[PDB]
Each structure stands twice: as C-alpha cells, then as structure tokens.
Design a protein around this nucleic acid. Structure first.
Length: 1236
RNA sequence: AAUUUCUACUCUUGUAGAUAGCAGA
DNA sequence: GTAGTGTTTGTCGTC
DNA sequence: GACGACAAAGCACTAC
C-alpha cells in the first residue's frame, strides 16, 4: 500500500461550464423563432406564477389550521419545569414535548390525526401527496379546494419544464415540515407563538390580581373595537383560546387588540424612513427612557446575558470586568462554608441569566454609571445629529457615500443600544418601561435591513450575472446523450480541428455517417444502459405482456419484439424473479441457508442475462465475450459490478461537413462552439483544469476504458448584457502596469489611477509628492490592441453546463477512508508533516518537519506567481480602509483574500505531492486569532479549509500526464468527502486539524511559555506577592546576564493553570551585546519591543526597551548592590519603594514577552527568556535554518509539531482511531519533555 | 485592462491559480 | 385508418 | 422505508 495508490477510491461528480458561440446562421434562426424571448418570459413568469401557486399552500394550510384543537397544558408544564430547574433532563423533556406537539399539527396536514374522521382525514392525504410535484399544475389540488385564462397561460409556460420549481418544492416542504426548523408552520405554532401567548396569560392574571379595576378596563377595550365578540377577556388569556390563534386573520386580530435596484432608490427610501423617525419622535422617546433610569427602580431593568460581555467591553477596561464584578459580589452574599462547588454554581448562573441594572451598578461602582451616561448620550447625540442632517443628491462621489454610511452607523448604534435590555418576559420587567422600549425597538427594527441593503448596493459589481435557462420548447433537453433518446432530448456533440461543438435539434435529422477520409465533424455516439439490476428485469421479465401471460398460463415464450433474435423465458425463471425475498438474492444466506438451491438459482439468472444482452437490440455487440463464466460467480454483486462498467460507451463517427453546414442553413441544427478561453487563437500556455477534464473526457484512452463519465441532465443558459459605463483602452493611449519594475510590488490603488490619468495626459491636477517619486519607477505601455474592461457582460452570451463523473470505476461513496489513511501512516514512519499558520507580517507561512522533528523547509506564501499579496497589496488596501472606511473598500479585501486562498491551495497540493506528507491545518473551533494578522478569523479561513478538502477530493495536477496516476484520468484521492463544518473532526484523510492556541508564544528550543497572566495583577500588594514568589535574581559577573529562578509550584494564583513539564525555570536577562547573525547583520541581543505607554493606551506606539540596561540603570539609581551576585528581590522588598517594585514587574513583563514586532522598522522575531540544555538562549534573529527563521515560522513549526503528536499517538495506539483533540496541558508537557 | 467566472495581473489578441452546477437563505 | 410525436417502472444504493 | 439514476416499456392523440 503505497502513498501513490490513493486513486480510484470513490466517485466524484463535477459540473463544467462553457460559453456557446453561435456558429453560422444559428443565431438568425433562434431570433427568428424567438426561443430566447419565450424563455425570458418563462423565467419572468417564475415570478408571476409563484404568488398564484402560493394560494394553494396558503388556502390548504389555513384550512387545516382551522380544525386544530389541542390541550396545551402538557406543553406549559414542560416549559415551566425547564425554567424552574435548569437541568439537561428538563431540556430534553421539553425538546421531546415540542416535537410531539409539532407532529400533532403535522398530522392535520398529512392526515394522520385521531381528531378527524377517516373521510376528512384521507382527503388531506390525497392533497399533501401531490402538493410538492406536478400535481399542483393539474388544477386537481385546486379542484379539491377556478383558474383564469392568463393564469392558465402562465401554467402552460412551464409545460415539460416543471423541474424549474425543483428548489421551490423544497422551500415549500420547509413550510409544512414537522422538524424543529424555523421555516415551518408547526414550529411557529409550538415554539414561537405559544410561549408568547402563554406569557401573555401570566402577565394578564398578575395585573388583574393586583389591580382588579384593570379587568373591566381591558374588557371595555375589547368591546370598543369589536374583536372576539363571542369571547370574554379572561378566555382570550386562557389556554383553550390559543387553538383559535393559529391563522393569520386571528393572529392579526389578536395583535390589533394589543396594538390598536437604483442609486436614488436608497436615498428616497431611506429619507422616507428617516423622515418617519422625526414624526414618531423616536429619538425624544428614547432620550426620555434613558433619562428615566436616573430615578426609577433599577432592580426591574434587566440587561440581557447575550450582551453583558459586549457592554463590559464598551464601558469598561475589558469584557471580563462586569462578569467578574458580579461574580465577586454574589460570592460576597453566599451562606456558610463557601465551597468551590458554590463558586462554580455562581459562575454557571452568570452565563445564562439576565442581570438587573441595579446589581450591575452595586457591583461595578459609580464609574459604570458615568460610562453608561456618557455612552448613552454619545449614541443619542449622533442619532439626533444624523436625523436632521440631509442626505446628498446622488451616490456618485465617495464623499456622498460616506455621509450615507455615517448616518446609518448612528442609526445602527441606537439600534444596538436598545438590544442591551432583556426582551423575554421571564424577568419582572417594568410596566411602562418595557412597553415604551418595545415600541421604539420595533420602530428601529427596519434600520438593520436598511444598513445591509445599502451596503450590498454599493459593494455589488457593475455587472448583471442574472440569467435564464433555455429550453427550446423541450422539457427534457440535454437530459440524456444516448442515441436512442437523441430524438426526444435534441442534444449532441461534435469535434473538429480540436474544437468541440454542441448541436441542438429544434422543433428527425437522419445523420448519414461518412468515411474518415471525408472532411467534417465527428459526432459523439453515446450508448448507455443504466444498471443491469434494474434494466434487465424491466426489459425481459417484467414486461406487462410477459408478466400477465406467465401469471395466468404456464407455457414458455420466445420474445421477438425489439430483439435481434427471439429470446426465451421459461416459467421457473419468472418464478425466480417473483417467488412466493428473491431466491437468487441473498435470501438463503440471510436465513434458511441452502447452498445447492442458491447456486442453481444464481447460475440460471446469470446465464439469462448473457443471453438477453446478446439478443437485445443495442446491447447485442457491447463486448459480451469478456465476461467470465457464470456458475462460479459468488453473487449478483460481482456480476453487476463487472457488467455495469461495460454498458457505458462512447463512439465517434465522421459526418460530412456539407451535411452539418447545410443543416444549420435550413434551420434544423443549432451549432454551438464550446469555448472557454482555452480554444482561442492566441492561446499559448497550460490550460484550465476543467478544460483538461473536457479534453481528457474525449481522449482516446478514456473512450477505451472509462474513467470520466459524461453524465446527463445538462443545462443551457442565456445571459442578457448589462453595460452601464463602457470603459476601454482605445488605440493611441497608454496602458500603465499595476506593478513596478521588480514585478512584485503593486502600486497603491489611489496612486495608480492618478498615474494612469497623468501618463495618458488626462489629469488636470499635479502629481503628489509620493506620486512623483513613483513616476520614474513605473512602466508604461502603448495600446497595441483594443482592450475592453469586462468584455464578458458587454454583449449577450450563451452558456452550457455539463456534469462529469470522475473516478467512475470506483465505489459510489468512500468506505473507511480515514482507516485506510491511518493504516498507511502506521507503516511509513518517515512521512513528513506540513503545518500552516497565518502570520502577522505575512498571510500564510508553512513549515515542513521530518519524522524526528528537524525542519526541512520553511517558506513564506505572501509572494505567489511573482506578486506580493501581504507586504504590499493587502497593506495598501489596508491603508485605504484607514483613510476611507467605506463599504466598497471592505468588499475588495474580502474578495482579495478569497483570491489569495485560491493561490495558496495550489502550493499546498504541490508541496504535499513532492513530500508525500500529511498537511496539518489549525481547527477553528478552538482558540481565536489576533486582529493584527492578515487573514480574518473563521470567516474566510473556514471556507479555505473546505476548498482544500474538495480540491484533494479529486486532485489533478495539470502538468502530470493523463495516463500516470495524479493526472486527469487517475486523480488523487487524499481526503474524505466533505460533509459539514461541525461534523469534521481532527482528521479528514491526509488533513489533520490541531488547536491553534499555544503554537506561537512558545520557545522552540525549550518549549517555554509566559507562565503568568498579566491581567490578574493591578495593585501594589499583588506586585509584592508576584516578586516574592521568585526564588532569586543575581548578576552573573562572568556572563553579564541576570538570572531569575522561578518554580512552577509557586505563584499559582498568577499562573494560567497549565504547569506542564520542567518544574523549575531560569528566566535570564541576557546582556545587550551586539551579536551577529548568519548573514553578518548586527543586532542588539535581548532587545524588546514593548507597547506599554499608558494605562488605557497600551498599544498606541512601540518603544525600544533593553531589559539588561534598564535594570542596571534602576539598581544603580536605587543604590542596590548587585556586582557581588547577591539576591536582588530581598533587597527590593526590604527597600519598599513603589516605583522600583512597579518598574521591575514591567521589566519581567518585557523579558517574558517573546513576541517582538515593529511594523515600521520591519522586525518580527522571538527571543527566548530561558536557556536550553546547551546553555544558549534562542534568538530567531540569528537566522539559523534548522530553527524557525521568524515569529510566523514558529507558529507553523509548532502546529506541524502538534500534528506530529497526533500521528505519534496513532502509531503507538493499536486501534486505528485518533484522540478527539489534544489538551493544552498535554501539548505543553509533550513539547517541554521532548526538548529535554 | 480584455476570463465558463473568481482573484490577481499584462513579455504574452492573453498570463497564473482556483472553480459542483441548479433554486432558496 | 396508423404509426409519429410527446409518463411510469425496474431493482439498486442510500439511508 | 421513501428518494435519486437513468433509460426504455407504456399510453394518448393526432399529421398524414
């Protein structure tokens, strides 16, 4: 079992796309008969007919909901018990109780409820059966419930084309489904409206009991409107009335008892909604509500737990402070011996409960109220200052786009503020406050969709990719390529001079083949026979005439209808097909074994099949002699696995050029050249993968032995043109490049446009200082030939979609792919490992490690195909965001990252095959990535991992030959088929996923990590404790380095809870000597880039810091003797100076900071604070090639080491299974012990 | 700035990589 | 008239 | 225990 043998494991289906160029006079014939216009109306009716069809669903669903009568007492008790006890047993009890009620509603739809009689119950089943297929159009379902002529004309527009509603059928199943999905009617009744109605009944009785006069007052409101005349006010707040609140008309009446495409379109609609906010005075109402909070009872104003951490980060130092302050005050009011169990109960309570505003203020201090007041007025003033600010006239200028976004940010800011308060009725909400808040919260609700609509309008491309499929009045066009079904599908293919053509017969063309010597096209003859397990009984035994004759009368028969010679069927072989489980099937093997009867039945069936294939019309000559004798086959399985591949075949027969060309002239054939930019006249270079798929499908070897099957169900399309502002490079102008002379640094976007206007003599202004300096370095080109910016959408285009099945000879689905991969990895201990980590100074960095741990190659992936993506392109695009912060610039970056990740896919698969390695990514469930990194978190990288699995699902390298494995005919199968993001584990074929955290902040030489969390210590007293835990600090005179001994069994409150190996450490203040690297460049050893500037501004600017030089400067000023090598900590503690004790902790902060990054001066290195067994401190500035070169190298190096940990456990464990993740402590113990 | 179309691009009337379509979020 | 044009079934695999 | 995968067997109804 070699690595190179991971081919032909399971089938992979892909769909190709091509542009059909009308050849000859086929364009005139199409327009003359108007297929395109008729098809345009049909897609443009797919919108007129949809509301008409919905009348059937709406009426039938409404009618079924009118008879629903249920007892909701059980559902209420399950809701109460879950709110009472928050245990997993009461949750599962509620989930089952909800599923029971959803099915009770579902049984009204399908007709399986005991509440209705059989006559009514069965009538619904006859409707629900044909409710999601072509029976909607019969009028039959509407006959159970009258069409107009225009509606009838709209129904017939989809004659032989109702598959256009394929996805729509699924959307309507989501409406009537009984599953726990929010698109469904049962879910809306059971899990959405009833908890609201159940809460309404509780709010009602509490008010009536406290204020009984409110009862007659509520009754007067109901009588004064006229709703629910036959129902009193107490009954509408009782459970039985909810059965009459299941239809929209009743829901509307219930709610009324409670309540009583273009540029100017975004301006007219927003200003209309904007001017509506003034008339409702929602700002004045909101400003009055937040002003009430200064005097009203704050123990009944609740903050949502889903927003508490967000509020903490917006009003306090960190997200932690609020949850922690509430934790300390609640522990402060526990009873008796406060165990660690009681503390964990307080922790879990704070995760899922709403906190009242008073408990927050009493726990956080008066400085939260000032933060709450300041943030509230800040948001309210911005929304108030935006409602009176008028919108611009157009969105032509970016300055006019900015003010539209600025006002939407103020509107979304107020909308964000209102969602701070808990909405659920589980809390004791204020009467007036909850009503006034919910009113303005729902009146600010449309502002969220207005933010998203406007952004998509500005970030959309100037094209119009919308398109409608072409049917040519044939419902089953391109459904199948077979010659027998050629007539009824009207789709064929050709080939001539290496150019592939598609032929369509519009509303017989008896093509007469000619010899190969005659010039012309080569028609593809497609012969297919789906499966012998189903075709042969259908065509031989289960014929209607044959079955009826044998059931009644017992004599045999010679079948001479559609057969080259009569075939024969005896009485017994029909009984073998239909016994009194089938005998030739594995019936005896499953139960009641009989070997003698089995083989006789098996051999009779197989010999029948061979005779039938010889006598059937089109299978009479398809290589039937290659079958191996019948009597010794084990079962039908290995026969059909051998018979089905032979049935599929493709042949090419020459057809005269005159016949095809004249056929197009007379209008009986619609030629269409398949064109995908790889058949152009100027094409010189390696082609697209899909072209190789298409070229390899018709290669002589593929027809000889099938590996890529040409599936049916192909589709055609037509894309109307959409040109708004055609811009092109006409002759006589100058085409400026987007890269400099070195061909790797892109020009900034704003500067390139200015230079393009200047070099072309169109800029009326003067080049800026930076623009002028860039002029001598840019290259210009004359317009040799005319170029159109996005020529694709300038004119109408046809499109052809065709599916292919790669690895057709393999199984349908993979069978234990991970087990096979693990088995190979077990027997090949020398396999290398590939790790990928997103760096801060570069997008992607990769390191490959051998079996025993040494690095074979560390590379930066920010320069792909002679183009720098991170250092220049993403950085200047990032610079644009800081300058503008508009919507369009945000869209460009997201598109660019996806384009970058496409390039990275090629390098991973290329490097993998060269090393035959397993690539270890980082799983996204665990950890979080810093904002300074180029690639976003879990947004674009999560899609990138899926694209890697899909690429390796069927991997082809376009340089590899077709015959050799790794090519188009025999693609690699290196990963299992993708199922879901959540379903995938730590291993998917040759891809391993490891936890991201603790991979960069680690010394590669020692495995050391910063053992202290710096968030814990703020106070002077904690600084005394922190520096007391350390054993001793002394100045080694011989080496000139301070040594700080630390023991992991101390300062447990300041650690992070991850001891690891190495019970004792020696943190050293290495001397600031001018060391030299491999290249000879000088640097100062021990240099640290620390960002500590202010208490609130700890990141604004970076400063050079030298721990050795600042420590000796501090000790000298304090007059603390250190040349003798004596302990320094006892002297500092007994000296008792606040400044020295404070500064020393910051120095310990600095030394422990391995990550040193400075964007301006271009340093990114890791300097270790501890020495390894050799007695040398790691410093990546030395550029040692056997250790990580840069900081981003360390992250990729340790991610690959984490994958090595999983692979090592694979080898040591007897079973072929992997641990479901690895703990942080285990990883720390592994790396620290390994380096010892 | 020309692409089945997506990104980036222009010695090269195109280059390099990706690309499972269809309907609905 | 009469066949040329223009929905249903076969065991599977998959669940 | 119902849903795809395909053709080819199965019924209408009329152009010829």
């Amino acid at each position: 079992t070699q690595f190179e043998g991971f081919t032909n494991l399971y089938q992979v289906s892909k769909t190709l796309r091509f542009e059909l160029i009308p050849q000859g006079k086929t364009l005139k014939h199409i327009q003359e008969q108007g297929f395109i216009e008729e098809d345009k109306a049909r897609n443009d009716h797919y919108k007129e007919l949809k509301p008409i069809i919905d009348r059937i669903y709406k009426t039938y669903a409404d009618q079924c909901l009118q008879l629903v009568q249920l007892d909701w007492e059980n559902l209420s008790a399950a809701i109460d018990s879950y709110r009472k006890e928050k245990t997993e047993e009461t949750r599962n009890a509620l989930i089952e109780e909800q599923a029971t009620y959803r099915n009770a509603i579902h049984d009204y739809f399908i007709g399986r409820t005991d509440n209705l009689t059989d006559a009514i119950n069965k009538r619904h089943a006859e409707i629900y059966k044909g409710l999601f297929k072509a029976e909607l159009f019969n009028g039959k379902v509407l006959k159970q419930l009258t069409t107009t002529e225009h509606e009838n004309a709209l129904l017939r527009s989809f004659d032989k084309f109702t598959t256009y509603f394929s996805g729509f059928y699924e959307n309507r199943k989501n409406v009537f489904s009984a599953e726990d999905i929010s698109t469904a009617i049962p879910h809306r009744i059971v899990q959405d409206n009833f908890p609201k109605f159940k809460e309404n009944c509780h709010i009602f009785t509490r008010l009536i009991t406290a204020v009984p006069s409110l009862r007659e007052h509520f009754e007067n409101v109901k009588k004064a409107i006229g709703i629910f005349v036959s129902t009193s006010i107490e009954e509408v707040f009782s459970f039985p009335f909810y059965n009459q609140l299941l239809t929209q008309t009743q829901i509307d009446l219930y709610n009324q008892l409670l309540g009583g495409k273009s540029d100017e379109e975004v301006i007219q609609s927003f200003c209309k909604y904007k001017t509506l906010l003034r008339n409702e005075n929602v700002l004045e109402t909101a400003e009055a509500l937040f002003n009430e909070l200064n005097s009203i009872d704050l123990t009944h104003i609740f903050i949502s737990h889903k927003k508490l951490e967000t509020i903490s980060s917006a009003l306090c130092d960190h997200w932690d402070t609020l949850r922690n302050a509430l934790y300390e005050r609640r522990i402060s009011e526990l009873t008796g011996k406060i165990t660690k169990s009681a503390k964990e109960k307080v922790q879990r309570s704070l995760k899922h409960e709403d906190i009242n505003l008073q408990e927050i203020i009493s726990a956080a201090g008066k400085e939260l109220s000032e933060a709450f007041k300041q943030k509230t007025s800040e948001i309210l003033s911005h929304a108030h200052a935006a409602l009176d600010q008028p919108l611009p006239t157009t969105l032509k200028k970016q300055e006019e786009k900015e003010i539209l976004k600025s006002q939407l940010d103020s509107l979304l800011g107020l909308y964000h503020l209102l969602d701070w308060f808990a909405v659920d009725e589980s809390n004791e909400v204020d009467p007036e406050f909850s009503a006034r808040l919910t009113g303005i919260k729902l009146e600010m609700e449309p502002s969220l969709s207005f933010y998203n609509k406007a952004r998509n309008y500005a970030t959309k491309k100037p094209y119009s990719v919308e398109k409608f499929k072409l049917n040519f009045q044939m419902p089953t066009l391109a459904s199948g390529w077979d010659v027998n079904k050629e007539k009824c599908n009207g789709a064929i293919l050709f080939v001539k001079n290496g150019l592939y053509y598609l032929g369509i017969m519009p509303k017989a063309l008896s093509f007469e083949p000619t010899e190969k010597t005659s010039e012309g096209f080569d028609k593809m003859y497609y012969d297919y026979f789906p499966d012998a397990a189903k075709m042969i009984p259908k065509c031989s035994t289960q014929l209607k005439a044959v079955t009826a004759h044998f059931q009644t009368h017992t004599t045999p028969i010679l079948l001479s209808n559609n057969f080259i010679e009569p075939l024969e069927i005896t009485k017994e072989i029909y009984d073998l097909n239909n016994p009194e489980p089938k005998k030739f099937q594995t019936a005896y093997a499953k139960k009641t074994g009989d070997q003698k009867g089995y083989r006789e039945a098996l051999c009779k069936w197989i010999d029948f099949t061979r005779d039938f294939l010889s006598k059937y019309t089109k299978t009479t000559s398809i290589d039937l002699s290659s079958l191996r004798p019948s009597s010794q086959y084990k079962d039908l399985g290995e026969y059909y696995a051998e018979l089905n591949p032979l049935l599929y075949h493709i042949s090419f027969q020459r057809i005269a050029e005159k016949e095809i060309m004249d056929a197009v002239e007379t209008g009986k054939l619609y030629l269409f050249q398949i064109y995908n930019k790889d058949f152009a006249k100027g094409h010189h270079g390696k082609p697209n993968l899909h072209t190789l798929y298409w070229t390899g499908l018709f290669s002589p070897e593929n027809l000889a032995k099938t590996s890529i099957k040409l599936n049916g169900q192909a589709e055609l399309f037509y894309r109307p043109k959409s040109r708004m502002k055609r811009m092109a490079h006409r002759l006589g102008e100058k085409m400026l490049n987007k890269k400099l002379k070195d061909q790797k640094t892109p020009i900034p976007d704003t500067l390139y446009q200015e230079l393009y206007d200047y070099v072309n003599h169109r800029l009326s202004h003067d080049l800026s200082d930076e623009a002028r300096a860039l002029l001598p370095n840019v290259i210009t080109k004359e317009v040799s030939h005319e170029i159109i910016k996005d020529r694709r959408f300038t004119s109408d285009k046809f499109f052809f979609h065709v599916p292919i099945t790669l690895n057709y000879q393999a199984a349908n689905s993979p069978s234990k792919f991970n087990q096979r991969v693990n088995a190979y990895l077990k027997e090949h201990p020398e396999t290398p490992i590939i790790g990928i980590d997103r760096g801060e100074r570069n997008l992607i960095y990769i390191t490959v490690i051998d079996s025993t741990g040494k690095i074979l190659e560390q590379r930066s992936l920010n320069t792909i195909q002679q183009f720098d993506y991170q250092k220049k392109l993403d950085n200047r695009e990032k610079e644009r965001v800081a300058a503008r912060q508009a919507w369009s610039v945000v869209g460009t970056i997201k598109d660019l990252k996806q384009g970058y990740l496409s390039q990275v896919i090629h390098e991973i698969v290329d490097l993998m095959i060269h090393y035959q390695a397993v690539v270890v990514l980082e799983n996204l469930n665990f950890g979080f990535k810093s904002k300074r990194t180029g690639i976003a978190e879990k947004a674009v990288y999560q899609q990138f991992e899926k694209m890697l699995i899909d690429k390796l699902n069927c991997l082809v390298l376009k340089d590899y030959p077709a015959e050799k494995v790794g090519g188009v005919l025999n693609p690699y199968q290196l990963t299992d088929q993708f199922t879901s993001f959540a379903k995938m584990g730590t291993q998917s074929g040759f891809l391993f996923y490891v936890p991201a955290p603790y991979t960069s902040k680690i010394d590669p030489l020692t495995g050391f990590v910063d053992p202290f969390v710096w968030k814990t210590i703020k106070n002077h007293e904690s600084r005394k404790h922190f520096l007391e835990g350390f054993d001793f600090l002394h100045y080694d005179v011989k080496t000139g380095d301070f040594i700080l001994h630390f023991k992991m069994n101390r300062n447990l409150s300041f650690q992070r809870g991850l001891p690891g190996f190495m019970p004792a450490w020696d943190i050293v203040f290495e001397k600031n000597e001018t060391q030299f690297d491999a290249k000879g460049t000088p640097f100062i050893a021990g240099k640290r880039i620390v960002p500590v500037i202010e208490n609130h501004r700890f990141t604004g600017r970076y400063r050079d810091l030298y721990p050795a030089n600042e420590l000796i400067a501090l000790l000298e000023e304090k007059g603390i003797v250190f040349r003798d090598g004596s302990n320094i900590l006892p002297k500092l503690l007994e000296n008792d100076d606040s400044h020295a004790i404070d500064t020393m902790v910051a120095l310990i902060r600095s030394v422990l900071q391995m990550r040193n990054s400075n964007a301006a001066t271009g340093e990114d290195y890791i300097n270790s604070p501890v020495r390894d067994l050799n007695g040398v401190c790691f410093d990546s500035r030395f550029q040692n090639p056997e250790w990580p070169m840069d900081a981003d190298a360390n992250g990729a190096y340790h991610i690959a080491l984490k994958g090595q940990l999983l692979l090592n456990h694979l080898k040591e464990s007897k079973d072929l299974k992997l641990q479901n993740g690895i703990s942080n402590q285990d990883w720390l113990a592994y790396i620290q012990e390994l380096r010892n």
